[PDB]
Amino acid sequence: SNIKVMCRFRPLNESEVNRGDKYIAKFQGEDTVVIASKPYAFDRVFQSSTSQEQVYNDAAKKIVKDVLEGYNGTIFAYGQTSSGKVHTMEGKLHDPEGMGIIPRIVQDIFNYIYSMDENLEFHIKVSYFEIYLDKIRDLLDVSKTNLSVHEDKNRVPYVKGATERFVSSPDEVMDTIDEGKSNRHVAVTNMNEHSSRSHSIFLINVKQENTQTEQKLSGKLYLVDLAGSEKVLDEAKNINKSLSALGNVISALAEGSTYVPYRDSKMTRILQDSLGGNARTTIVICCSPSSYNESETKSTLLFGQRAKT
């Protein structure tokens, strides 16, 4: 199994401080967090004061290199609502300090590409879509609202009709993310409720061709901001279904099973060529350190434990 799991704790938020919550996360070394005297070991644990830069460097940087070598990959943000998933995945998009994983990935991709000599030709294209109530919508074309999953020649599942946009700079990709977030408001009355109950999926497809040696390489990287994992409606059941499917896929891979139940959900089907097999995966579980959220945090930590070999 190629899955790594890293746990990120955010600082206590304003409500938590005012309410008088206790900081219940205890840290041991760089890989362990202990809750109520019970330890949970991961590939890495980030404490509340961990910077965006360091999170990227541990969770994502190496996967970006693999994608530039022709690997596929997935990076997930998992955790209850307000645990810091979007701050981690997106952060402040145009801010060199505040930017999250996706902007740093894109920068790294282009930094490598523009440094290469004339023998290499690159084509970078991005897609951005969401899954809500078990329906796929293109965030770059809001007329595309119930996209189906299809399989190509080589039995590779794909989203039929999803917008694929060619990009040639990090600024252009950020502009694409900005447009997607704005488009996401279409037909949505409450964004907080919607975003907490849907999964957002950003895809970067990096194709390269050395015209001198006549070699081609292609790498796909999916960046997934999952629905909130909290136990707190048709929305709930759909969300339970999609995360439980991902859970079973992760456990199957962690067991070294040859059979992996990708078909358990649309999402895992979509990610089939970039999750398991020879693809690289990091799950970043996000948690509140507040005593008030102790039950959901334990649940999040136990979800992360699934990837343990």
Numbering used by the authors: 7 to 238, 248 to 324
Relevant lines from the article:
Kinesins are a family of microtubule-based motors that play important roles in intracellular transport and cell division. Kinesin-1 transports cargo within cells, a process tightly coupled with ATP hydrolysis. Whereas kinesin-1 in solution is mostly loaded with ADP, ADP release is accelerated several thousand-fold upon microtubule binding. Here we characterized kinesin-1 P-loop mutations that interfere with ADP binding and determined the structure of the corresponding mutated nucleotide-free kinesins.
